[PDB]
Amino acid sequence: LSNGHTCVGCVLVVSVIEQLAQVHNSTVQASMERLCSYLPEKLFLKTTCYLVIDKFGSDIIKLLSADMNADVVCHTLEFCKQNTGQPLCHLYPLPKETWKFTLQKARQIVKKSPILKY
Amino acid sequence: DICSLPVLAKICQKIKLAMEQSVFPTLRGYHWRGRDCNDSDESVYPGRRPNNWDVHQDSNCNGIWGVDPKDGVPYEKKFCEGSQPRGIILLGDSAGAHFHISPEWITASQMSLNSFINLPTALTNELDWPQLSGATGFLDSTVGIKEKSIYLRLWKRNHCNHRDYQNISRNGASSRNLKKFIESLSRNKVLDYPAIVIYAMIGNDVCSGKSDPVPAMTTPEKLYSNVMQTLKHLNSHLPNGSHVILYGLPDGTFLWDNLHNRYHPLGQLNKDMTYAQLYSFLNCLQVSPCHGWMSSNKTLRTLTSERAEQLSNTLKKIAASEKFTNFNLFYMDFAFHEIIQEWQKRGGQPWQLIEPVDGFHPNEVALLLLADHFWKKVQLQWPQILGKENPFNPQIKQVFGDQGGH
Numbered sequence: 001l002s003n004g005h006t007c008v009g010c011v012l013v014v015s016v017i018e019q020l021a022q023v024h025n026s027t028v029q030a031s032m033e034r035l036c037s038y039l040p041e042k043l044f045l046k047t048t049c050y051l052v053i054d055k056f057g058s059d060i061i062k063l064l065s066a067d068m069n070a071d072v073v074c075h076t077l078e079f080c081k082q083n084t085g086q087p088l089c090h091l092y093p094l095p096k097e098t099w100k101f102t103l104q105k106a107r108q109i110v111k112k113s114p115i116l117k118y
Numbered sequence: 119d120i121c122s123l124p125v126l127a128k129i130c131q132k133i134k135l136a137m138e139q140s141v142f143p144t145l146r147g148y149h150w151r152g153r154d155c156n157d158s159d160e161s162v163y164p165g166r167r168p169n170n171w172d173v174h175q176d177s178n179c180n181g182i183w184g185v186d187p188k189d190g191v192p193y194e195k196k197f198c199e200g201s202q203p204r205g206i207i208l209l210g211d212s213a214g215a216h217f218h219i220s221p222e223w224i225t226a227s228q229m230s231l232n233s234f235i236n237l238p239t240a241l242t243n244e245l246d247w248p249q250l251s252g253a254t255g256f257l258d259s260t261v262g263i264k265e266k267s268i269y270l271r272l273w274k275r276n277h278c279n280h281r282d283y284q285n286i287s288r289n290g291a292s293s294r295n296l297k298k299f300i301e302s303l304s305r306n307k308v309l310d311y312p313a314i315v316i317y318a319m320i321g322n323d324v325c326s327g328k329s330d331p332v333p334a335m336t337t338p339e340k341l342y343s344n345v346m347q348t349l350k351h352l353n354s355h356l357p358n359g360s361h362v363i364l365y366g367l368p369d370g371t372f373l374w375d376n377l378h379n380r381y382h383p384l385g386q387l388n389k390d391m392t393y394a395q396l397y398s399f400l401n402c403l404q405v406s407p408c409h410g411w412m413s414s415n416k417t418l419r420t421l422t423s424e425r426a427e428q429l430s431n432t433l434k435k436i437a438a439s440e441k442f443t444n445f446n447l448f449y450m451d452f453a454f455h456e457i458i459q460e461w462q463k464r465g466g467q468p469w470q471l472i473e474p475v476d477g478f479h480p481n482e483v484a485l486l487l488l489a490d491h492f493w494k495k496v497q498l499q500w501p502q503i504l505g506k507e508n509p510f511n512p513q514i515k516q517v518f519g520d521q522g523g524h
């Protein structure tokens with residue numbers, strides 16, 4: 001289930017992935033793999049890092065590669081859920097394009113599934 | 119709760135296990151309290167009066183034991199009897215436990231394999247670093263200030279106090295919930311030395327995450343009730359001759375004033391996120407550690423500082439009037455303004471006293487400056503609290519060296 005804490009955590013991890021790619025001028029995929037290689041094997045940290053790439057990696061790549069920010073990503077993946085009526089929670093400034101249209105784009109980018117995993 | 123995510127199931131389960139295998143189980147590891155020198159014998163632990171002067175076994179784990187072959191006198195009797203040993207005990211919150219998220223874990227520009235080596239231990243200790251705290255820290259400060267913790271200054275004044283520290287602190291502790299873990303305090307009226315007890319609930323009574331945090335803040339009436347229960351409890355467990363010090367609450371407006379325009383570690387790369395944006399983000403989610411003070415709503419910040427002043431005055435009033443048989447009571451202003459002044463005399467900026475990642479807690483420098491202010495103020499106004507310097511300190515070091523370490 002998604003709550004305020006899962007939202008903070010998704011925004012944190014995605015931000016770090018984004019900035020690690022920027023610092024090393026690399027793909028998002030290579031950024032996630034580099035981050036997981038930095039983590040100790042203790043307490044299943046490195047293992048968990050690789051479970052997250054497996055479950056969420058392809059969509060983080062698709063969205064960041066479209067120049068969506070960490071707020072967009074975490075709303076698209078439902079770690080952050082805006083109840084109808086309630087205000088919008090965002091850590092980074094709202095993008096140039098309007099949020100409602102930016103989020104529709106994001107949902108359509110991950111609805112495409114040209115690759116199946118067995 | 120974060121552990122609702124299926125992908126985190128294995129690491130959440132393994133964190134829970136490691137905590138259980140420490141011997142609130144973490145509160146017994148040596149980061150939180152003096153290492154037990156013999157965990158197969160429950161009459162051996164730090165803080166107790168020596169059993170038969172420790173002629174065979176070091177029963178209080180202070181590294182002083184045995185007999186001098188010159189005169190057949192027990193070293194513990196020659197070196198520590200009369201010196202009036204005493205322990206240090208902190209009843210605290212996330213600041214007393216030194217909650218700390220390392221910027222190295224989240225700032226990509228300097229991140230490497232070296233950065234996360236300390237992460238597993240921090241996770242099994244709830245991200246608290248009591249071994250570096252201002253009250254009970256014993257490791258070499260990772261920063262560049264000579265000041266030491268209250269515990270180490272106590273050891274320096276009297277080497278017989280080695281290992282007699284207890285940090286009974288929890289993230290989210292307040293006057294309301296302290297009774298849920300105060301039982302982890304270990305002290306026996308008859309068998310143990312007296313203790314200095316610091317009561318430092320410095321935030322969570324006015325700090326909340328709810329959108330309307332004013333109704334959640336403790337009232338002076340409820341605080342008085344909670345603290346009297348705690349003091350009645352301590353009076354039944356502390357040896358006669360103990361001292362209890364109540365800390366007031368901070369004027370938490372220094373956070374917003376000094377940080378709202380500064381970049382967070384996640385915003386330093388592209389200069390696109392300030393502490394103001396973080397505070398707004400956390401309040402919109404209702405997960406801020408302190409909505410009242412971490413907010414752009416200057417009215418709300420004032421109502422929080424106003425209640426903190428009322429609660430502080432309650433503690434001051436309890437200390438002047440209420441009496442107890444086994445300890446005397448003292449009140450101490452948090453006095454962060456004076457901490458800032460001392461830092462500025464060392465060339466420092468106020469924003470450098472806050473934990474960079476959360477923008478809320480005092481960092482290691484601040485905790486050590488609070489300990490230095492505590493020491494100088496107590497030594498000046500209430501010297502009895504700290505006792506006398508032990509003339510045999512040099513002879514203790516010559517016979518016992520580092521006294522076993524920590």
Ligand SMILES: *[C@@H]1O[C@H](CO)[C@@H](O[C@@H]2O[C@H](CO)[C@@H](O)[C@H](O)[C@H]2NC(C)=O)[C@H](O)[C@H]1NC(C)=O
Nearest residue numbers: 020021022023024025026027028030064065067
């Ligand atoms: C940093 O990586 C970027 C990748 O975006 C590189 O920039 C692109 O390089 C190729 C050259 O073959 C071009 O097709 C693109 O037009 C470039 N720009 C963009 C926006 O993609 C760049 O080469 C790398 N920088 C360094 C110093 O190696």
Ligand SMILES: *[C@@H]1O[C@H](CO)[C@@H](O[C@@H]2O[C@H](CO)[C@@H](O)[C@H](O)[C@H]2NC(C)=O)[C@H](O)[C@H]1NC(C)=O
Nearest residue numbers: 154155156157158159160161162174175176177
């Ligand atoms: C730790 O405590 C145990 C006591 O539980 C000590 O074991 C005793 O040691 C003495 C030797 O002086 C023997 O007479 C007893 O028979 C031992 N008791 C048991 C149950 O074996 C042990 O020596 C202590 N060790 C240290 C380093 O303090």
Ligand SMILES: *[C@@H]1O[C@H](CO)[C@@H](O[C@@H]2O[C@H](CO)[C@@H](O)[C@H](O)[C@H]2NC(C)=O)[C@H](O)[C@H]1NC(C)=O
Nearest residue numbers: 329330331332333413414415416417418419421
């Ligand atoms: C700024 O903070 C104050 C204090 O919380 C808010 O005022 C209170 O708002 C609650 C609504 O949740 C009411 O119950 C009180 O009657 C209000 N008191 C006062 C003095 O206004 C105020 O609404 C906040 N301002 C903004 C813009 O959020």
Ligand SMILES: CCCCCCCCCCCCCCCC(=O)O
Nearest residue numbers: 008011012212289290322407475476
């Ligand atoms: C993605 C945004 C960046 C994340 C920055 C971290 C947010 C702060 C997390 C630590 C705050 C919690 C401290 C607990 C305090 C208490 O319980 O007393």
Ligand SMILES: CCCCCCCCCCCCCC(=O)O
Nearest residue numbers: 005008009010013052056120405
């Ligand atoms: C994109 C999937 C990643 C989600 C799991 C990563 C969670 C990392 C730490 C979470 C931070 C907790 C925030 C908080 O304490 O309030």
Ligand SMILES: CCCCCCCCCCCCCC(=O)O
Nearest residue numbers: 013032035045048049052053120
């Ligand atoms: C590229 C994927 C990076 C994801 C890193 C997040 C997983 C490791 C850190 C999670 C720590 C969670 C500990 C906890 O739940 O208390």
Ligand SMILES: CCCCCCCCCCCC(=O)O
Nearest residue numbers: 012013016120219223224241
């Ligand atoms: C970016 C991956 C490393 C970040 C680890 C920072 C600490 C994780 C968040 C702490 C909260 C928790 O563990 O419940």
Ligand SMILES: [Ca+2]
Nearest residue numbers: 156157159162
């Ligand atoms: Ca023992």
Ligand SMILES: [Ca+2]
Nearest residue numbers: 172176180182
């Ligand atoms: Ca001893």
